[PDB]
Design a binder for this molecule. Structure first.
Ligand SMILES: O=P(O)(O)OC[C@H]1O[C@](O)(COP(=O)(O)O)[C@@H](O)[C@@H]1O
Ligand SMILES: O=P(O)(O)OC[C@H]1O[C@](O)(COP(=O)(O)O)[C@@H](O)[C@@H]1O
Ligand SMILES: [K+]
Ligand SMILES: [K+]
Ligand SMILES: [Mg+2]
Ligand SMILES: [Mg+2]
Lengths: 501, 501, 501, 501
């Protein structure tokens, strides 16, 4: 059986050999990057079923992200399998400042009255916590009494009980025992801090990514369609119109504007890390199931992200809760599941990919029984979608090992994928931009082929490439879909059921 | 908008012209049969929607039947449209004898005690009714006390109160007021009277029919699968393997043996006349729905028969219950509705066909909302059946004016029909046996075409035959199914969605 | 066991003996009504399953209708069973006049040109048909060129091809061969002849009927809510607020206003006779199913009317199409089936009721498998309604022989009836108006009892009434519903499942 | 918003105070158990939503288990709220022995060849790992070449490559890098070590548990119905027939015998820790959903256990994974969710219970929209069950705040619970065994009350207990169910819908 749900793996030092040293040994950050040895490691993640690599520009400067992307291009040749290239923007960040006298952190206790300063370019004291806000924005006027300020992935919460106009300081009450360390992520849920739709840092990060060559951008903290439209404009300008934009939904505002965001984007990344701090943590599974249904209904890509195999960062086995989360994300109808720290900076990047692949492959076999998505409810809004519906029906009527589509732009493949047939989908395309562009769509196995000439038998070509890929053997039944004849046919218009000889 | 539900019309004097006179006109029986004028009159039934003519061998001799069949063959050429040919057998029958003294009938009152004689060759008296039993069988040992003897379309009931061994007479009580006339039909419900599986006279009737050229045999009072298999043996013996056998379910035994009768036959005629006398009348609607569903699930033809527009025998307008009966037969899922005395012996044969066609045409538009058949429940047991399922799916996703199948034996057109698509089925076939064999399948418009050569584009032929037939025009979307390419393809294996040029 | 679908039987001269004479005999109408022999005939229809008698004010004067009502009152005492009393208005009928020269009828041929007169109080000639318009209305201005005048149950069509202002005659073309006889019903479909919302003669007939004692009024040709509201005002102002109104839907305007008619009425009579003339005959089965669903969703009574066993007017047995019609009306979800000429004028009134009761009883056993009504879909809009839903659930979960409700006004009985439980409904009420008012609700067996004391065990009273009615025996499981306790309870608020001692 | 999903919290040192020190603090184990301060910690778990305490007989002697049970009996009096008492057996555990020279652990690399001894009562060396097998059983004959020995929650794999018959030692190959620490769990999947159906240690522990007073026994590693029936015999033999048995399904054999184990047991604990080691980890979510469905269909209790908020052992926040796992367990249909190490040995026992209670409470609001259980499919096999079905129908038809049942044994409450009504269930019972007996049934709020007299209004009692309990206010709608009248009723036979005054 082939794996239909796609894997995004984040790259970091965990895979990268430096002068024979594995990550986090004595001296490691001294030695020179070992490019062949690293690439051999990354080629193992590809063979274990990583379909796209995520380059997280929250961490590591341009040269490091340049070097990692080039190491991946090497690994593609060692594996003999191509992968997608996804850039993840930094976006708006609030961090806690340095402390007076280079103190790393302080410990607080429930009931404690302290203050949070809004003045920029100062240091924190134990008593007065200062913020490093992207663009040095003043946030005093943006947050009201009763709002919460949450420090370090939401581990410590401060309730704003009052506002001091003379100092521009929040009077806060500590809500639980915990630590405030320096240069730690701060969230302020249910506030509209006027960060730009697209910051200048993220503009430059994107333009460099587009230069090196990428297939996808995931845009952090998308709040309105404007955040997506402005990234789109740049993709257009530089002739990178092939690039697909996933909005990262991370906060209440993003969730409020989700319908317009989906309309503007090619896909949604469900960024549960932030979203779980920014909205009631118990609501995240509600939003997860709703988002997946709405994006699938739009024929777009949905990625479920963050903590999927979290304990595998430090321990060799996933917990029962983590296997359950990966399985249920498949059953909910996700196109893709993602690894962050587990692949980027953990002790078990390869085992983490193998584990997610094993769960994902198992879960796809339960989609008939338990799948939340319902393709019978969709309006078939074009003739290609009608063909996709009929392909679904054939794969429901009898045992179809494979669907094969000859697809110029990938449109047929995306509509077949949308209907979630009980078969793998071989997308035969004629250019690498379409090929890589398809690597996160559920079920789709993109494969490069010569454009069929008017004398070619498209059906013989489809059967032959399917046998070449080892996907089917003698006696297997396959469905082939194509625009027949080539030149005359305006769209996919023909379906054949073919016994493989 | 074409009529999907097929009409069977029974031929008789009502459509024959004698010396420029219609049936019922003064002098009619004193004029000679006008063959051409009759053929032109029958041509009007073809144009109005008759798809098959029934030749009832219960009435008239071989000479009369043979000449009716020859006159329909003329009518086909005048209308420019072919129809099926159906022989309906005499089968097991009991009639009241002639009365001593050339008396016509007597009248009887409830509770009156009389006798029914079983001795063959005798005349009836007022107090002693003699039976003409088919093949002069002695029925005395096969009817128990408490059984009922019903005379003339079930109008008069006689309870068997005792058996007189010396006279071989039944002592009977008159259960209701009514008349006994000579040569009227007698039923004895829930007896196993040992009429042969195939009587000699039905053997000879079927041979005569097979010599004339027929597409269908309706076997009267099928009691077991043996009744069907013995007719099949003659069809096989004579090289008439193409002839489809419809079992007429008319009594309790046929209903007990329904599953084995359906397996052995090509279809069922729901013969409601005898059925509603031979089982409790109020159960006939139950048996009708059940049979339609079982036959449809087997991919076979079901004909709903008898009294559907009964009043139009004598009146120009159908009753409200008659329009309701024809409508509800369509919703039940009937392939065909039948006219008996309405077309054969009535004053308004053309109006009867037209009325039936108008009802059938309107009821077909309500099969989506009210239809009792459920194609989603069927096992697709072959590749031609999964193609039929996918055509049904395409006709549910978008407006398809027509499904075109190129079919060698009609097998693809039978399976498309079974799934009751939201479109007309144009069955392009290569011989006239196949063509006329399809004329009672729901939705199917059979049409003769030259066998395509491996040079011929079947999708162009399909489109051109449909434009030439008047069925589609520019802008209409059609589904085309075929075994591509001719030579290699072992079955129907391809579907195209095509906008007609 | 008990017949849940109600029968309305039309009373006419078929059951009425007058000075030893029967309908058709010379001097019949001059002889005095033999009230006792007539009541014994009617008592037989009551025993055979008639639940309500219809008095058709289209035929016979006030005295005739008055004597016929008094004879049913006597028949109730002979049968020992009460029935409802339904008055059916004449309404805006048009009829062909008497001819000159005492002529009964004339023959006409397709293409013949004749005239229809609009002038009132004159006589038809062969060439000039005169119309007897209800209220002597002048229709000349309300029927345009291109309309159709239909004579005699829709049997002869006349196309208005011109209008002569000098004589105020329609110039018509005979559309088909047939007969214009005297006093035959005329319809002019798709016209708004401005007959008043309530004519003086219908006003007078209703008032006469209210004075005699009636439960129901069926209002002929309801076009708007106004037609119902005008009869409502009269029932209310005379102290007859208990009288229930059934709108007869007989024409296109009635169908166009169906939803506000149902709101304003207590029920609908599906008057198929005129409806099948006034709209395309093939649409009637469509409107019947839709009407029955809508009326049942409002908790109101639907009567399926006209031609149900038509041929039993003249012949001893129903056709197979007639049995199918009554069976399919039950499965559609009708509360009540109706007889007109079959019971009012025919040769076989007792046998027609018996036949209809046998069909209804059988058909009820198939409502769980085939029944078109879906109670699971309704909004439960009150707590009496949620209790009726819970009763329906108990009768679905186990074998419940009987549902008993103690109901002051019949509201709880109506709502249980709406949900169509798999059980008979014993409605114990405390006055005869309510008791007779429940006689047409599906499943309801109404029965008189004293208003229970706040002393009384209502669940014991219910069991005892059920044993006294012969409905249950020792071992049977019954559902009892009541407002507990009396005085404190504002509504039905209790359900008990009890095993009969 | 009452929490309908029940919480099982495992007791351990995490909640125990010893001379003013919390668990983990310097010198903790030196100080003595402070019973009052421990009981006050435990009362806070009770207030936050813990419904039953698990006493895990895998860890601590009888003296420690007994003290802990007495402390919870104090906590119930401080909380003002009763809780269930669940004993969890040791069962057939294997552990790594102590090392020679008191060495704590050793590290191994992939491909190392070592030995595992079967000899009982000796210490391990690096090269020869010794096993503490439950009951000192010799496992040498039970594990074949090619089997896997896994150490410490499945973290390190040892493949058996050969067996030395002389020393009765396994030759094993290290399959992955990791640690063998002393006294860690060992698993040998897909073997059948002949552990007795009931080991003497588990017999003794259960008998100690029954003498102290328990409501529930969770039987570890149930392989067959016989493992349950042996504990059942002890419960009955000792007067403890009320005690409920949960089979823990933890290996392949229990899964293979699931249907038989469910028949013999009162419920299932889905013991995902051992299950995910003993069967393919990716299959665990499959078995979970299936178990929940079958157990619910049986009207029994299902507890979903292990790793549910794992990270909250060491960190203040749950991962997105863990929230997703608890939420999906609720949607699957679990009666109860469990905390093990998170409540027994973690830093945040209270915040763990609080967190789970928040997820569980939010998830129940979505069971209507997303719930996998379907009560419509159940056969109602008894009159109580039909009453449960009607209750469910009323809670779906309108807004019912509370279902009240007066239940002597808890049968009516268990069946109402089984049907998952959209309301809390107040179970008023008359003894403490039934009260505590019901604390793991979904939705059930057990409450001790006086047995109603012959004179009492049970519907007044129901309303009044519900108001006193703070569960309903004026104008709320409730559903009350009872066997009325008291002393006459043989079962629940009455449902009332009452507005709180
Ligand atoms: O797919 P199925 O049901 O096995 O049927 C395949 C058979 O039908 C046929 O295709 C006949 O089909 P048509 O008569 O429709 O052309 C045969 O060639 C073949 O043997
Ligand atoms: O529950 P609903 O639909 O509000 O109806 C309540 C009304 O029904 C009644 O209970 C009448 O019911 P019955 O006639 O069935 O006893 C009135 O007392 C009350 O006003
Ligand atoms: K015949
Ligand atoms: K009338
Ligand atoms: Mg017959
Ligand atoms: Mg365990």
């Amino acid at each position: 059986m082939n794996k239909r749900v796609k894997i995004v793996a984040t790259l970091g030092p965990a895979v990268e050999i430096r002068g024979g040293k594995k990550f986090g040994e004595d001296g490691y950050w001294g030695e020179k990057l070992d490019v062949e040895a690293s690439a051999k490691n990354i080629a193992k993640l590809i063979e274990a079923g990583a379909n796209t690599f995520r380059f997280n520009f929250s961490h590591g400067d341009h040269q490091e992200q340049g070097e990692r992307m080039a190491t991946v291009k090497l690994a593609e040749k060692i594996a003999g399998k191509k992968v997608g290239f996804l850039l993840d923007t930094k976006g708006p960040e609030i961090r806690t400042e340095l402390f007076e006298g280079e103190a790393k952190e302080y410990s607080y206790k429930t009931g404690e009255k302290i203050r949070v300063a809004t003045k920029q370019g100062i240091k924190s004291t134990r008593e007065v916590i200062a913020l490093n806000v992207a663009g040095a924005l003043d946030i005093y006027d943006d947050v009201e009494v009763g709002r919460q300020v949450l420090v370090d992935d939401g581990k410590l919460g401060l309730r704003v009980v009052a506002k001091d106009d003379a100092t521009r300081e929040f009077e806060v009450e500590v809500e639980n025992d915990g630590i405030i360390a320096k240069q730690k992520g701060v969230n302020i849920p249910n506030t509209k801090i006027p960060f730009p739709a697209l910051a200048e840092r993220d503009n430059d990060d994107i333009r460099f990514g587009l230069e090196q060559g990428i297939n996808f951008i995931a845009i952090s903290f998308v709040r309105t369609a404007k955040d997506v439209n402005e990234v789109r404009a740049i993709c257009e300008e530089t002739g990178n119109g092939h690039v697909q934009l996933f909005a990262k939904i991370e906060n209440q505002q993003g969730i409020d504007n989700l319908d317009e965001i989906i309309e503007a984007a090619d896909g949604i990344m469900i960024a549960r890390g932030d979203m779980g701090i920014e909205v009631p943590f118990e609501m995240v599974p509600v939003y997860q199931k709703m988002i997946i249904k709405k994006v699938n209904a739009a024929g777009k890509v949905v990625i479920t992200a963050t903590n999927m195999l979290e304990t595998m960062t430090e321990k060799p086995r996933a917990t029962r809760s983590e296997v359950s989360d990966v399985f249920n994300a498949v059953i909910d109808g996700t196109d893709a599941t993602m690894l962050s720290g587990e692949s980027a900076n953990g002790k078990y990047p390869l085992e983490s990919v193998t584990t997610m692949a094993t769960i994902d492959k198992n879960a796809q076999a339960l989609l008939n029984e338990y799948g939340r998505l319902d393709s019978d409810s969709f309006e078939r809004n074009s003739k290609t979608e009608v063909m996709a519906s009929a392909v679904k029906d054939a794969t429901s009527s009898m045992d179809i090992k494979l669907v094969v589509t000859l697809t110029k732009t990938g449109h047929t493949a995306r509509l077949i994928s949308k209907y979630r047939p009980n078969a793998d989908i071989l997308a035969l395309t004629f250019d690498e931009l379409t090929e890589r562009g398809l690597m996160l769509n559920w079920g789709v196995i993109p494969m490069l082929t010569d454009a069929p000439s008017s004398t070619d038998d498209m059906f013989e070509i489809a059967e032959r490439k399917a046998v070449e890929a080892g996907l089917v053997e003698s006696g297997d039944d396959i469905v082939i879909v194509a625009g027949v004849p080539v030149g005359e046919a305006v769209r996919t218009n023909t379906m054949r059921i073919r016994t493989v000889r």
